[PDB]
Amino acid sequence: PFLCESEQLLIHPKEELSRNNSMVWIVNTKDYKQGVRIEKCLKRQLGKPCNFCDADTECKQLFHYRTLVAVDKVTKKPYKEQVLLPSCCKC
Amino acid sequence: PFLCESEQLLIHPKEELSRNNSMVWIVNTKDYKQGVRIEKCLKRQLGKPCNFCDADTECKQLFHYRTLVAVDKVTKKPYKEQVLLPSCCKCAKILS
Amino acid sequence: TCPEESEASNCSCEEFPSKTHFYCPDFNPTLYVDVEDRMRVDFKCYDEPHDFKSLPNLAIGSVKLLTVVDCVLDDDRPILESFKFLEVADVRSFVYNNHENGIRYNAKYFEGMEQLENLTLARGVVSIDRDTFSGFLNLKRLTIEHNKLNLQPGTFEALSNLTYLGLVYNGLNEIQPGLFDGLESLEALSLSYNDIKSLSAGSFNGLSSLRMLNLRVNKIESFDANTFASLKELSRLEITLNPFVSLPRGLFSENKKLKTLILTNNRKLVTLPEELLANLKELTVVNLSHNGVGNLPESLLSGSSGIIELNLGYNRLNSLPEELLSDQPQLQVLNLDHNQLESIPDYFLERNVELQTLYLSHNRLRSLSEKAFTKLKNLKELHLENNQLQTIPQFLFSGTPKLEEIYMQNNQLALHANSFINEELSIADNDNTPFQVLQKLRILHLRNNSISTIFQDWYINNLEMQSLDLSFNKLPGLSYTQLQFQSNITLNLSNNEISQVLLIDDLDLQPYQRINVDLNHNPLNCNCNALKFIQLIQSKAEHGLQFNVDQLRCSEPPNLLDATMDQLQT
Amino acid sequence: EALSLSYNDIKSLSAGSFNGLSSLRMLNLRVNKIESFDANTFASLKELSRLEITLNPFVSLPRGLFSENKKLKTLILTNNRKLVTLPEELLANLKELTVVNLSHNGVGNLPESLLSGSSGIIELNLGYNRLNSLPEELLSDQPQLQVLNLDHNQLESIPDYFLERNVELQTLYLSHNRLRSLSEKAFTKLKN
Amino acid sequence: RFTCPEESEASNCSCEEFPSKTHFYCPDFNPTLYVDVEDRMRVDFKCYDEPHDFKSLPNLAIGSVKLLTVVDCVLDDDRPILESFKFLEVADVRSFVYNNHENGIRYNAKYFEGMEQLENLTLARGVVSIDRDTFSGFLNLKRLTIEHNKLNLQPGTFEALSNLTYLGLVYNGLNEIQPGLFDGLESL
Ligand SMILES: *[C@@H]1O[C@H](CO)[C@@H](O[C@@H]2O[C@H](CO)[C@@H](O[C@@H]3O[C@H](CO)[C@@H](O)[C@H](O)[C@@H]3O)[C@H](O)[C@H]2NC(C)=O)[C@H](O)[C@H]1NC(C)=O
Ligand SMILES: *[C@@H]1O[C@H](CO)[C@@H](O[C@@H]2O[C@H](CO)[C@@H](O[C@@H]3O[C@H](CO)[C@@H](O)[C@H](O)[C@@H]3O)[C@H](O)[C@H]2NC(C)=O)[C@H](O)[C@H]1NC(C)=O
Ligand SMILES: *[C@@H]1O[C@H](CO)[C@@H](O[C@@H]2O[C@H](CO)[C@@H](O[C@@H]3O[C@H](CO)[C@@H](O)[C@H](O)[C@@H]3O)[C@H](O)[C@H]2NC(C)=O)[C@H](O)[C@H]1NC(C)=O
Ligand SMILES: *[C@@H]1O[C@H](CO)[C@@H](O[C@@H]2O[C@H](CO)[C@@H](O)[C@H](O)[C@H]2NC(C)=O)[C@H](O)[C@H]1NC(C)=O
Ligand SMILES: *[C@@H]1O[C@H](CO)[C@@H](O[C@@H]2O[C@H](CO)[C@@H](O)[C@H](O)[C@H]2NC(C)=O)[C@H](O)[C@H]1NC(C)=O
């Protein structure tokens, strides 16, 4: 029912990609833990073209920026500096 | 190109106001905003059937949930939040 | 066609299109007589009596519907005889009004009147004989209204084909047990505006095929336990304005075909009997509003799974049983407003799934369990207005994604800016609130609430909001950030405590998108840094934002106290 | 703007009754006891498009009654009581009147120049007039009309030259009449 | 209202309750397996990354599900499905969906031994071939749907079926509709 199919995941990320590019040791301690819904695109479908249509378009994968305390292990130290994370698949 | 007319939008964080200060203040805080980024379809304001794919379709708006859970410092009951943000706008095939 | 040789007759034919009026005493207007193209005649003697003793004939021929208004009759004579001059043929409906003369009836009056369906006597029959209707061949309907009548048993002896016997303002004082004996095939019975005292179980003996009974105004004080037993075919019962204080047990357990039951204005009614509506698989619309019911039996609606709508408004009910709504998964529209209801039992509604709209207004509500709405996947409206809900659960709207319109006007809810979506530990880009979860929410009415803040989710999660009512709030100020709705929205911030409006010149909405914001009756400071706002009001041509800012006036700057915006000089 | 007198007990009409109102376009008299008139009664009402008088015992009318008002679009005279005759040139040179009805008036005579000069008429009725004879044969001089009803009249003969002006006359009624014969020349112009 | 009866740290499989849906995931950090559970109707069993076993996982008491869904999960050889998912305790099921992306297998009636009251069904992929009758005439199979399968059928393979109010084929790659393939669809 979808031209592009995305596997849903919860990541609880550490050292996630970011804008500043200086975000390492993200906080997922068992007491202070942050997770983020992501829509990973299916591996075999990264470049194979979208189905249910004749579009020559492939199922490309976007990215988006989310607020997480990834800059430092201590929580609220970066005031939720924006981290880069995967987003849905769009042809 | 993409199947749906999705447009990036920036949302500024809610600004704390010092209404206590009757005196004017620097708009520099108003000048720069960290902000957040979202996505929405204006495809007929998210109504387009994703025209150039002819299969029975209608563009949908999709959301993502962030789960931050911390046991309270006063060792109260564990506090969990699931903030929801419009994240993508995607097209889906439909029956008849 | 008008009557030729009109010179001899006193009557005058007006020869309108499809009419033919008459005023037979030409000198003094009287007997206004018209004819609707042989489909219907009419006849009014309003002025003076006995004026038609020697009238010339009119030769109307045959006509379907006759109507006589306020005209005298000759007692021992069949009606057509008294109006022989009309020369009607094959009357098919005979509506009579007699404001003036009360005439006893009998069989003789309707001699020659057969082949007649719609009979009707408004003030015509003061008293009815036992043999009056026997002459009729087939009589589809009947109706006597606006007269004090005395009824003897079995007067409707041989009206077998009768249907919709209607009595309005007839005010019979008591139904004789044999009143309806010998009568069948009634698709309707009217007891509205009657003076009936009680209903003996034999009072409905004759009826077998009745399908609809109405008691819009009745003085019935008591029912017999099996009053409605004989009414096996019944399909709708309406009771309004009845002084009965209680019902007999199992009263309706016999009328299994019943479809709609309505009880309204039973101010004396206080306690419904147990299992009153049990096991009526057909039932589809039950209304018990405006009564004085105090507390509901748990098994009121056991086994009555066919309900679609249920209504209990305006009662004095105080506390409710979960078992009542356990087996009605077809229900669509519930109502509980104006009760003295205090708190919804948490698991009250977890059984239904079809419930479109819900009403709870005008109660004494204090709080709601998160589990209250856990199962209403198809809900689309909600009315929590006029309820003393000081606080709400954060995880309230988890299970109702299709919610459209929600109204909490005159609520005691006071969710603050923080402490509604945060515990000072986790920062959220979009506030986590029950309103945030309902993305498809559009119309909201939080007017008279004290939240004093605007939630970020309202314009992030709720993309299609169209009407926001934030009136009578304690909000300190409005910020441009707190109004980037983008989508067409009506913003009301009137009667608020707002004093600071912060904008930025680069403010611009999506093209063709216009939002109206109202700021009247606010104590608005007018020192500097409100300047950009004055620029967006004064010397404003056109933009996305509009401002119903008529009654606003600067409050605090003393030099400009109470000067309206247009008054003000930048 | 609009004035009506239906089921009124008024037994007379004064000339000064209707003064103080240049802009009146509607006058209705469905029933009245009025038996007197005056040509100046309606004079002030120059803009009176419609005048309807019915169920009135007036035996006759004054000359130049409706002549003063040139803006009169319609005139109705139905169920008149003992109206023996009509004044000559009552509607002379109206130029605006489209419909004139004299039905149910007990008139024994007809005037050739009563309707002369009204080049707007499209409907004309004389129903139940019971004219002992038709004196007027020059009523076609306003031939623009298309309808006519002369039914329930006692006229013995129909004038040969009565119908030589009109060609657009669509509909005609002559029933309940005393007609011994029909003119061989009168029907040659009724093309429509 | 099960709410993970077994202790979490024993199997490290943690879950959270909400009014909507008591979610679940086992690895507790970067979770490979997710058991979404609507309180009454839905069930979502998803293992996008390979699952080591179905025994160390606890036993989530669930009465019945008006709908079930298995996603990208290996199915046991010649077992009933619920037999394979014995740990996932579910008794009465009406609908069904199955979307095995990887390691497709042929099918049988054995795979449906304990699932013979299925109003619907769907095998979104991984369908090599349906050797024997899909259902042994199992009750009220109102709808059916196999898609993206790239299979090849036999004529009248479906004849045992009668109440298929709807049958759906998408991306079947099937070269030719063998004659009489739709033989038994009396009430289609
Ligand atoms: C909010 O409501 C306003 C109505 O006040 C909507 O305005 C309408 O917007 C559409 C496009 O956004 C306009 O259509 C345009 O028409 C011109 C021709 O005039 C055409 O050249 C354009 O290509 C476009 O089709 C429409 O005229 C306009 N109508 C009015 C009365 O303003 C607006 O669309 C609504 N926005 C949302 C988000 O609901
Ligand atoms: C098995 O799958 C079928 C899918 O057709 C499910 O039944 C169908 O459920 C849909 C809900 O999306 C029903 O559609 C709604 O139906 C009503 C009544 O006809 C209609 O007024 C609405 O506009 C809308 O179409 C549909 O009626 C219903 N039945 C059919 C034959 O389609 C069924 O629930 C599934 N079984 C299980 C156990 O989940
Ligand atoms: C397709 O639908 C029909 C009808 O819905 C199914 O036939 C039904 O099969 C069941 C299974 O045996 C029958 O139930 C049995 O009924 C008897 C008599 O009441 C009872 O003694 C048994 O204990 C059992 O309950 C049911 O009567 C029967 N209905 C009809 C109308 O024949 C059929 O099985 C469905 N599937 C296929 C593949 O046809
Ligand atoms: C007797 O009364 C009934 C009740 O009005 C008449 O039936 C109506 O007829 C009209 C004519 O088309 C319909 O528009 C209504 O819907 C009918 N109502 C009902 C309840 O049937 C009937 O025509 C009357 N018959 C006579 C002879 O007067
Ligand atoms: C009730 O109506 C029925 C028909 O609707 C009448 O039945 C007819 O009765 C006459 C004599 O009474 C017979 O000659 C006919 O053969 C009957 N026809 C039918 C179709 O039944 C019946 O008479 C009416 N009775 C009353 C009391 O109104």
Ligand SMILES: *[C@@H]1O[C@H](CO)[C@@H](O[C@@H]2O[C@H](CO)[C@@H](O)[C@H](O)[C@H]2NC(C)=O)[C@H](O)[C@H]1NC(C)=O
């Ligand atoms: C705002 O809401 C409050 C609380 O509902 C309203 O105060 C009530 O007013 C009614 C009618 O006068 C009284 O019967 C209640 O006793 C009042 N309750 C309390 C606790 O004060 C108030 O009138 C509303 N104001 C509006 C309409 O804006």
Ligand SMILES: *[C@@H]1O[C@H](CO)[C@@H](O)[C@H](O)[C@H]1NC(C)=O
């Ligand atoms: C806004 O609310 C106030 C008070 O509730 C009311 O007086 C005003 O008319 C409202 N404005 C609109 C546009 O409805």
